[PDB]
């Protein structure tokens, strides 16, 4: 149907403590599958998913190599960044980098991602045309020019149309049971009296995948935003996701409220009511 592969990179310089901390993760949709930590006792690409654990030594040697190379590239980017913004070597700085590809339903390249930020703020990002670069500020324009001069977008794109889709399809094929699934959320409504005149209605959706989902409250059939609280979708720790939405309701009007959940794991959108 719709799948994606992304890679995340975080490098943090630590003055007086040696080399910067480098942490990178690999995701297939909402499922992590690889890991590389520079501060691991033996830095190397590690399997974080049962289905990639079948890859031969080659995969891990190459993956580790590319990971370390990425780390070097990141330290390098840290220094160069210090130079662009004219910053001291005694201060800490963070470089973040996310890049991936989306596999269409026809086995083609649907869309690509390649964006990097410096100190929590946008630095430079590849446009949807997959040909031009957009810099967020003055210093990043140096990187934009340097990448325009060496045809970086061309190579990264050769990657998008090549190894990215290939290994993505492969991963999807090896982990069909857990990657090509659409586990619907186990939902239920709970009641929690705030006082004697008020009571909080909480809508629960648990153990669903992927993470994408929408919870909304309705009063008498009309959307409700007032006196409402929706928490950020959260992992269960076992590969699934959770989310709940609550609304403060006058005592005696609970039966006028309905919860609505949208998740691709459900044939149709669910309508929930308080069932004491």
């Amino acid at each position: 149907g719709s799948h994606s592969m992304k890679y995340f990179y975080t490098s943090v310089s630590r003055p007086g403590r040696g080399e910067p901390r480098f942490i990178s993760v690999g995701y297939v949709d909402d499922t992590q599958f690889v890991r590389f930590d520079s501060d691991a006792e033996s830095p190397r690409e590690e399997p974080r998913a049962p289905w990639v654990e079948q890859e031969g030594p080659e995969y891990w040697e190459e993956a580790t190599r590319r990971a370390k190379e990425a780390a070097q590239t990141h330290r390098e980017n840290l220094r160069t960044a210090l130079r662009y913004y004219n910053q001291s070597e005694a201060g800490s700085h963070t470089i973040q980098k996310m890049y991936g590809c989306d596999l269409g339903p026809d086995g083609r390249l649907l869309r690509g991602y390649h964006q990097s930020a410096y100190d929590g703020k946008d630095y430079i990002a590849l446009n949807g045309d997959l040909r031009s670069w957009t810099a967020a500020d003055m210093a990043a324009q140096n990187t934009q020019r340097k990448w325009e001069g060496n045809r970086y977008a061309e190579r990264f794109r050769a990657y998008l149309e090549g190894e990215c889709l290939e290994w993505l399809r492969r991963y999807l094929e090896n982990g069909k049971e857990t990657l090509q699934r659409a586990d619907p959320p186990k939902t239920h409504v709970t009641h929690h009296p705030v006082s004697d005149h008020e009571a909080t209605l909480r809508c629960w959706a648990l153990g669903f995948y992927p993470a994408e989902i929408t919870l909304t409250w309705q009063r008498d059939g009309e959307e409700q935003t007032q006196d409402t609280e929706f928490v950020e979708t959260r992992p269960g720790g076992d590969g699934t996701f959770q989310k709940w939405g609550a609304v403060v309701v006058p005592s005696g009007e609970e039966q006028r409220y309905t919860c609505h959940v949208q998740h691709e794991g459900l044939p149709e959108p669910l309508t929930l009511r308080w069932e004491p």
Binding site: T10, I23, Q32, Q96, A117, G120, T190
Partner: protein, 98 residues
Amino acid sequence: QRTPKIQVYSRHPPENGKPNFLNCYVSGFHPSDIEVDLLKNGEKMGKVEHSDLSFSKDWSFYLLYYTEFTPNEKDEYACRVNHVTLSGPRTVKWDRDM
């Protein structure tokens, strides 16, 4: 810099005497320099591990510190977080309703 969001909860609906997994999910924070502890009755928990550092669309980091626990009426669990954007450590108790 951004202030972290704290969500302490259980993997499965809590039931007294029934084995379960305590989770502390901290998100929307920057930089990624942070300390997280799972507490039982005010004291640090025995075996606490966390997931690999990652971030979302707005570049904010998100971590998950988890451990095995079995909830009951007497015991009180919580999550303590130390971050540069926080004046002192923030402690969020685990509510079986949240």
